[PDB]
Each structure stands twice: as C-alpha cells, then as structure tokens.
Structure 1
Amino acid sequence: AEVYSQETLAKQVLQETFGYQQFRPGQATIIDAVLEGRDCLVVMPTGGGKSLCYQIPALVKTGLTIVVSPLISLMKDQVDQLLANGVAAACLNSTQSREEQQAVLAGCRTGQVRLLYIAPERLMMDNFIDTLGYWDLAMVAVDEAHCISQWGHDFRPEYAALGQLRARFPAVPFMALTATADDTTRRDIVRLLGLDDPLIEISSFDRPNIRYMLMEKFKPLDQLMRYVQEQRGKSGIIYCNSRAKVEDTAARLQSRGISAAAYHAGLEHEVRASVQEKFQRDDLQIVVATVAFGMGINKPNVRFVVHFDIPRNIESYYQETGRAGRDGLPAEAMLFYDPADMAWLRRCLEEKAPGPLQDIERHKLNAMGAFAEAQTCRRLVLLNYFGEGRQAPCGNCDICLDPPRRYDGLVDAQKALSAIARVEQRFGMGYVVEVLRGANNQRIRELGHDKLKVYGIGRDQSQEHWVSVIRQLIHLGVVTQNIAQHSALQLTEAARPFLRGEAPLMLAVPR
C-alpha cells in the first residue's frame, strides 16, 4: 500500500521529467528503499543513468537533496542536464561570484532549489553544517562514492569526514553511488559514511565488447607506436603513471605525425578543457594522460585504452579500461606490462606508514600484478576479483585468443643463471643480456667478459627471449633484482638445482 504509492509517484517522475516509460530491473527497488527512508549503496559498473537512482527520489521527496561531487566539471554537467529537464538544480563552488553563491543559498533556504551539488570541502566546514540545520533536508547523495575510500584517507580528507554530516542528520537518508568498488571499498564506504544497515545493490561488471589484452613490454615506444598505427585513426586513451612520461610520449607521437596531446594536472585548466573538448569533438585522436583524465568523460566511441604503465590497482584498471566502448561496439584495452614497473610501485607503497591501510593497498597492488601474470582468462580474474562468480572463459581476451604455450626451459635457465653467476651477481639485466648474446662493447672487453665461457652462449636467440627468461626466473623466485644494489641480478637458494640442472623446468613463450 504505502510503498506502491511511493513507486507510483516515482514512475510519474520517471515519465514526466526524464521522458522514460518503465523502470528497468533493480531501479524500483533502490528508489523504493530510499523513499522508505533507508540508506543505500549502489554499485553500477554498467551504465548509464545511475544518477536517476537519487534524482528521481529527490523529485518525489519534499525538501532539498544535497549531492556531493568530486569535480566542478561534474557538478556543471549534471546541473545543466537537470536544468534542461526543468528541474531546480544548482551548485556551489569557488568559480562562482559571491553574489551568485548568495542567491543559491537563498534558493536552498526557500525551497526553490531541489538539488544542490557541492564539494565535501565546502560542505564540511563547521559553519556551513550549521546553516544546513535550518534548511529542509530530504536526502544526501554521494556520487562517485569510491572517492570516499580512494581519496578520503589522504588526498582529500573531507571525503572521510562526511560521516560527521551523517551523524548530525540521523533522520535523513544517505545514498552512496559508484561504478567501481570491490568489497574492501564497499565496506570502507559504509564505515566512513556511517550508512545504517544499507540496501546494497551491485550490478554486473561484465563488459562483453571490451577485449582485455596484455603485451609484455620490451621496446616500450616501438611497441606502442606499432600498436597505435594498427588502430588506423581510431580514437583512444594512453595512460601513463607520471606527468613527465605523458609529455614525452605525447611529444614522441606528435613527431611521427599522430594526432595526440598530453593531459595532466600540471597543465592550465583552459588547456585541459580544450584537450578534453577536442577529444570529444573527434578533433583529437588520442589523449595521453595521467589518472587526471578520468571522471566525467562521456565519449561513446573510445575504441582503445592503453595502459603504458600498469596501474596501482584493479579498480583503477577497471575504471580506466571501462572508458572504452561505451557505445557497445568492439573496443580494446591493452596493457603493456613490465614486471619492473610493479617493483617500482611496491617500492612507493612500502615507504609510507605501516599498518592496515598499507596492507590493503599492498593487497590491491598485488592483485593487479596477479592479473598481469595470470595464465587464465583475464575476465575471469577481473570478474572474480569483484565477487562476481564465473568459471567459463570469455573467448575475448589475450589468454583465451592466444593460449600460453610452455617449453622445456631448463637449458635456457642454466645459461641465464650461469651468466649471472660468472659476473658475480653485481650487474643489471641489460648487461647480463649483452654478455649472453656475445655482443662486445667497451665494458665487456674492458672487464674481460669476452673470455668467459658463457659469453655469447645465447647469441642464437634474441635479447627479447632472454629478457623474458630472466623476468620469469625473477617471478619464480630464482633470481632477485633488488633495487638495494641498483637492481643487480642476484641468485637465491632456489638457483642451485637448476644451475646444476636435475630439477626440471617449464617456461612460457613471451606475449
């Protein structure tokens, strides 16, 4: 009785303001829970109107809905769309004049405004919280709610402070929405936001039109160039883990004539805006970017997402690869993997404060590395990482399309390990390989490694082959590459039996 009357009102809003006909599966349930006064956590990795989960009940309820958003540009996109549908929406941010802000605040006070978009830093100021007490507050919705967990612990602490708001207003329902959240992030959102036994609704993470590919990184730039050229004019994004790398890569692509521009947070806001706008207008083919190029990109025809450096966790990977193929047509995610890049990230993590937070981050990084090293379907790894049970392989990932192939690697291991032995475990990868292929430069003849027996024993095979062999022995735990001594290749206890070679060994051909 009381719950269907609510849903009836919601349906009319769905029709009258948004112009849709029927609720899809799951929508009515979330919307009803919110109308019934319950807290909600909505995880909709799919698409494409999860904003409706709060906008519709904000238009049925009497009072103001506050929507917390991480980005001025998001605030503006959503307020503008609501204004186009005739809804009294507004926002507050620092690019407004004071008199503009005052008029928004008076609108909230009078009930003219129905939805107010606002950043947590403004919202969580003590005095602002006090002014809210006097408004008629119907709901609080936190968009891109993964930011609570991903930013609230360090980069933007007011994201973690929103629970204080929750306790100040126990009678107003709170809703958190996100597209990417593993179990850890979900629990972190519930905790930090103080959600009270929330309805949790999680839809599928499957993107069947995205093909997940990985390529072992040997000649980064040449492989990237060859890959970009094979896209033959297609629109795409190339992610790197540093501003510098983004500038270089951008430049070096422009050199070869490719429509590419750099995008990162050290560029001026009018440049970033132009790059994004161009990319959207299809006036730019490729954006080369840090994580700054991200939220609030509604470009439906991104055909490839390249990770030139492996991301810091699977959620970032999922979210970034997921910008491809939003129109439903074949798109490709392509990861260029160097294990050394993992070691770099591991190093960055275990420099900061020990404890539970770092163990979570280390776990999530480690999971990213396991996805990269998997010899099973990539999609099975992703989907199961997110708690979506599946066992059948996808047929549309690099492991499924080109299965791993193993060979007797015993002899190769001997050569590589023996070569590392002879140089007394004081030299890096590049050097040890030079030795292996019998290629003579000054340092070989100078140090006298051209007379050694192992010198040139692997000249019959490429430097790519030996990098893969050695990368594999590091992964197996036979060889270390401790940054401690400038990434010198050292042998471990497990080296011995292979070096004498009665312990058998399969290796994999490189990807």
Structure 2
Amino acid sequence: PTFDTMGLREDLLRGIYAYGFEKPSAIQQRAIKQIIKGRDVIAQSQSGTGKTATFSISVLQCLDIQVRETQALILAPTRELAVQIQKGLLALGDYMNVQCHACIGGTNVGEDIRKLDYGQHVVAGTPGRVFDMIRRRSLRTRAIKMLVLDEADEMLNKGFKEQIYDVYRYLPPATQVVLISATLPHEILEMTNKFMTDPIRILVKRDELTLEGIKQFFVAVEREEWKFDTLCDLYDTLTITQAVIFCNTKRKVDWLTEKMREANFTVSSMHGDMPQKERESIMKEFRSGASRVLISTDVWARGLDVPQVSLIINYDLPNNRELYIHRIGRSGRYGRKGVAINFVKNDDIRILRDIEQYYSTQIDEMPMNVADLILE
C-alpha cells in the first residue's frame, strides 16, 4: 500500500516523498482516498506518524493552484499547532508553489489581512481568529470547498463550540467537512451529524452493524407484477425523504428504473457493470439531496459502507440471511435510527421467517400509519 496507487498529482507526490513520508498507514490510506473522493470524513486520530500529513496530503491534492483564493480551511485548538499545520502543508507542497497561511497574533493582524488578500490557498487558525477574519470580510469563503477540524475533541475542551458553528455558517451550502479527533464524545457527534451528510467513519474500535432502532416491516404483496403498484402507492409518501431501494439483479434494477421513469419518477440507479467514478458520481447526486429515490443492487462490499438513508426498501428479499442485515443494519454506536419496508411475496413469506428468526428480530406488516415515518 503506497501513495503511488492513489493517483495523486506528481508535484505533490514529490513533496510527500521529499518530506520523507514514504509509506501510508492502512487506515490512513482510506482517510486520504476517501477525503479525495469528496466524502465527509470522521477520522479518529491515533498517536502515530504524521496524523497531520494524512489530511494535509488530502487537502493539498484537492486544490486548483491557478485559482489563487482560499479553497480549504483548517481549524485547530492552538496557535502553535495552527502554524505547525502550515509549516507542514508548505513543506508538503513545496513543489506546488502553493500559498498557505496561519492566522493569529494580534500584533500581526495587519500582516494577517495583508496575506489573506494576496490570496491564501489554504488557511489555518484557531476557530476564534479564523471567524474574525471572516467577519472582517478579510477571509473569502466564497470559493472554500473543504473545512477540516483538526484535534476537534480538544477544540471543545477549550470551548470553541460556538465559534466553530459560526464558521460553518459563513461557509457555502455543500461544504466537505473532514473532522479529525482523538476522542469522540456524545457532543462531537452532535456536531458531526449537524453538518456532515452520510460521513465516512474511520474509527479505532470495531464498530458493527446491528439493526436495533430499526423498524422493519413487510408488505404482503402477492406476486411480482403487483410489486410495482405497491411501490408507487407508497412512493408519494416516500420522497418525504430519499430512499434506497434494493434489488437482486441488474435486469431488475434497469427494469424498475425505466418502469418508474416512464411514469415520471425521479430515480437514480446503479449496479455492478459500472465505473468506479460514475458509480460514486451517482452517489454524489444522491447523498446530495439531488435525487430522492435510488434503486440499486447490493454493490457495496463492506457492511456499513451503505448510504445511511432513513428508509430502505428491500424490493426483493435477499437469498442468504446474512446480508439482509448488511443492507438495512445501522451503526449502533454512531448510527441514525430508521426504517426498512420489505416486499415479501407468497414464495418468500418463508425466507422472511428465516430472516426474522436469524437476527432474532421482529418484522411486522405495514400499518396504514406512514405517519410513523415522522422521525428526523
């Protein structure tokens, strides 16, 4: 596992190796790989090598040199550290002729603003100071596309709660937010889910899927051609939120998609026969709020790596009771409660029992009550 296979730009990879960082951790590779994809990330810091570089490498990669204006903003708990981040960023992109500044001083506020105008590609500073420069109309958020909250757990122990929040506000509507932190309190979560849609969590302790908190139901359709109507009947109350509708085969997604679109229905659809860059390209739309109903086959390899949408419709019960959970199960320690409606036909009223019996859970029949879809 190296930096070579990550398709990072040359002038950076040079800096990386020159900086001396020769091989990325197993997890760090994910962090990087994922931040680049654009996903919101929650990486738990661990006493080790360059927990700074890992995200710095990320930040740097995702830049537009030719456009001199603040594109990435990093907040840290201390002036000293804010600087480090800078000295490091500069050292990593020495070969990218990148402009990067750290805000603070007071005796320096003039030099502070002086540089912000020359156009700082990346800015770092304590939440307080950074907010000030934004308030003073000195720091240009307009083109910012990434907010990184380093040592966040600490930022809070030093009570920057509000300032952070305030800074998010000045940032544009869809902004990528990478939070780095050694610990994860019941309040850092309150912040993560408060401005991070379907984030990638990279933790230290095993977090595992479990369907506790999930309301599971089944709509006793009878045969397949009757499924469609049953879906529609539900659909106008569905888009209430987005929804991911599964399926077991390519031809069956394709069918369902076409059949829903010739009926005027905003629907995205992805399967296995597609590109590692168009697939995640659809997702972009979907996690965005740009598409309400996504119909797909089970493509995600990992368990947790499935959209944390609040409503999942197994259009087809899965034929091996160990992925029914893979599909609808949540995170437990960091998951959002939710719903999943199952479409079991007579030939499957059985497979349904096996699943119910397997996870030792209960799957009820859909009540008229869709008003139970009230939850967040």
TM-score range, shorter chain: 0.3 to 0.5
TM-score by length of 2: 0.44
Highest RCO, 1 vs 2 (Cα 8 Å, sep ≥ 6): 2
| Greater Cα radius of gyration, structure 1 or 2 | 1
TM-score by length of 1: 0.33
Higher helix share: 1
